[PDB]
Structure 1
Amino acid sequence: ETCSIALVGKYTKFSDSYASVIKALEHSALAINHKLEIKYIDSADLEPITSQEEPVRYHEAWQKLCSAHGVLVPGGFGVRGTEGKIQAIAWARNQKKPFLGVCLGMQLAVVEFSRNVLGWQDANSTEFDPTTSHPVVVDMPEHNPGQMGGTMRLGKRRTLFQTKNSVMRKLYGDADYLEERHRHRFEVNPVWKKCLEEQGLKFVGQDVEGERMEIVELEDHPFFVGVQYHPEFLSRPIKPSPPYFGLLLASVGRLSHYLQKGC
Structure 2
Amino acid sequence: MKYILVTGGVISGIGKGIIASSVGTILKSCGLHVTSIKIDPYINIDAGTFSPYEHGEVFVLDDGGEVDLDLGNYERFLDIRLTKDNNLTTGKIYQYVINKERKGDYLGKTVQVVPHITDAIQEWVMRQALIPVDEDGLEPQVCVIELGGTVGDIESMPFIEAFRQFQFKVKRENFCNIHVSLVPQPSSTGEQKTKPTQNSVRELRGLGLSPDLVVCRCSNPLDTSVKEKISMFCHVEPEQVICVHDVSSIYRVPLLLEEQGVVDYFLRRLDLPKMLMKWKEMADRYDRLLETCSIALVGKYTKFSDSYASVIKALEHSALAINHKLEIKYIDSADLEPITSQEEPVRYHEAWQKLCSAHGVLVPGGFGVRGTEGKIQAIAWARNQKKPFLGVCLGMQLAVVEFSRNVLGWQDANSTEFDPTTSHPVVVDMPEHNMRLGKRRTLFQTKNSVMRKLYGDADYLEERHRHRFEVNPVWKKCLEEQGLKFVGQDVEGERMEIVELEDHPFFVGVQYHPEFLSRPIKPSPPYFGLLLASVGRLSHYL
On whether the aligned pair clears a TM of 0.5, the verdict is yes
Identify the residue that residue 187 of structure 1 maps to in structure 2. 470
Q: Secondary structure at the match of 1:8?
A: strand
Query: What's the TM-score once normalised by structure 2's chain length?
Result: 0.46
> Counterparts in 2 of 1:1-263, with a 5 A limit?
1-144=291-434, 152-259=435-542
Q: Secondary structure at the match of 1:179?
A: strand
Q: Secondary structure at the match of 2:294?
A: strand
Shift of 1:77: 1.5
For this pair of structures, how many residues does the alignment match?
252
CA contact (8 A) 1:13 1:41 kept: no
Unaligned runs of 5+ in 2: 1-290
Q: Secondary structure at the match of 1:17?
A: helix
Shift of 1:33: 1.3
Task: Return the structure number with greater relative CO, CA threshold 8 A, min gap 6.
Answer: 1
Unaligned runs of 5+ in 1: 145-151
Shift of 1:85: 1.1
Shift of 1:14: 2.7
CA contact (8 A) 1:13 1:40 kept: no
CA contact (8 A) 2:314 2:518 kept: yes
CA contact (8 A) 2:497 2:511 kept: yes
Shift of 1:196: 1.3
CA contact (8 A) 1:122 1:134 kept: yes
Shift of 1:199: 1.1
Q: Secondary structure at the match of 2:500?
A: strand
Q: Secondary structure at the match of 1:66?
A: helix
Identity %: 100
* 1: CA distance, partners of 2:520 / 2:415: 36
Q: Secondary structure at the match of 1:181?
A: strand
Q: Secondary structure at the match of 1:16?
A: helix
* 1: CA distance, partners of 2:302 / 2:459: 34
Shift of 1:124: 1.0
CA contact (8 A) 1:2 1:37 kept: yes
Deviations 1:152-177 (A, max 9, x none): 11111100001011101001111100
* 2: CA distance, partners of 1:87 / 1:243: 21
* 1: CA distance, partners of 2:413 / 2:336: 21
Q: Secondary structure at the match of 2:437?
A: strand
* 1: CA distance, partners of 2:449 / 2:480: 15
* 1: CA distance, partners of 2:305 / 2:317: 20
CA contact (8 A) 1:214 1:228 kept: yes
CA contact (8 A) 2:368 2:417 kept: no
Q: Secondary structure at the match of 1:153?
A: coil
Shift of 1:13: 2.5
* 2: CA distance, partners of 1:5 / 1:254: 15
User: After TM superposition, where is structure 1 displaced by more than 4 Å over at least 4 residues in a row?
Assistant: none
CA contact (8 A) 1:137 1:186 kept: yes
Larger Rg: 2
* 2: CA distance, partners of 1:165 / 1:143: 32
Identify the residue that residue 239 of structure 2 maps to in structure 1. none
RMSD, matched Cα = 0.9
Greater per-residue strand proportion: 1
* 1: CA distance, partners of 2:355 / 2:418: 26
Shift of 1:12: 2.1
Deviations 1:20-53 (A, max 9, x none): 1110111111111110011110111111221122
CA contact (8 A) 2:404 2:410 kept: yes
Q: Secondary structure at the match of 2:328?
A: strand
